[PDB]
Structure 1
Amino acid sequence: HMCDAFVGTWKLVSSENFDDYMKEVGVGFATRKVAGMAKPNMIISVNGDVITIKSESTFKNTEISFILGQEFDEVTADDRKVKSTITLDGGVLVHVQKWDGKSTTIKRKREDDKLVVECVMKGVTSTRVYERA
């Protein structure tokens, strides 16, 4: 029942500062422009201890499956090869990505009927709001 309130299909309804977040992470111009237009569907499911998070969009489809606290390999939508660990901290899913001596954290939170995604790289934060599809 660990992530019951996250489970479901969610659609992006608003974004703030995502272009700047992508710049901070290292994404190049053309990818930022195409990726920034996307309105992904985020689909979260749980089977036993395995959580799956899919992102589906016209830009790229991604899927990750993981156990909380157990590191895994991820290829991000912008083609970074990262080492990721996702934990639950006070009801927030905290996703840390490490690569090339850098780090970024993506937090996913249930707030009212929304799922709020906050992405941070050094001083740069982006907030992405999702609603039920």
Structure 2
Amino acid sequence: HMCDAFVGTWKLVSSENFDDYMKEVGVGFATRKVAGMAKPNMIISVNGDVITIKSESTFKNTEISFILGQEFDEVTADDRKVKSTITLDGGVLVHVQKWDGKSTTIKRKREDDKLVVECVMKGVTSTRVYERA
């Protein structure tokens, strides 16, 4: 019953400062424009110890499967090759991505009927709000 309140199919309903987050990450102009238009669905499931997070959009479809605390390699939607570790910290999924001596952290938390995604690169935060599909 690890992550029960996260499981399901979620749709993006609002975003703030995502262009600036992507700039801070190093995403180029054309990818920022197309990625910024997307309205992804996030599909989260659990089977034993394995959590799967899929994102489906008109930009890119991605999927990661992982065990909490256990590093894995990830190719991100913007085509970075990163090493990722996801943990549960006080009920928040905390996803750290490392590449090229850089780091970004993505936090996913349940707040009311929303799943709130906070993405941080250095001093820049973007907040993306999802609702059940």
Task: Please give the TM-score of this superposition, normalised by the length of structure 1.
Answer: 1.00
- Per-residue deviation at 1:81? 0.1
Secondary structure in 2 aligned to 1:34?
Answer: helix
- Per-residue deviation at 1:22? 0.2
How far apart in 2 are the matches of 1:125 and 1:56?
23
The count of residues paired between Structure 1 and Structure 2 equals 133
How far apart in 2 are the matches of 1:2 and 1:66?
13
Q: Deviations over 1:24-78 (max 9, x none)?
A: 0000000000000000000000000000000100000000000000000000000
- Per-residue deviation at 1:6? 0.1
- Per-residue deviation at 1:121? 0.3
Q: Deviations over 1:80-133 (max 9, x none)?
A: 000000000000000000000000000000000000000000000000000000
Secondary structure in 2 aligned to 1:77?
Answer: coil
Q: Percent identity?
A: 100
Task: Show structure 1 runs of 5+ residues with no match.
Answer: none
- Per-residue deviation at 1:2? 0.9
How far apart in 1 are the matches of 2:106 and 2:95?
5
How far apart in 2 are the matches of 1:73 and 1:63?
12
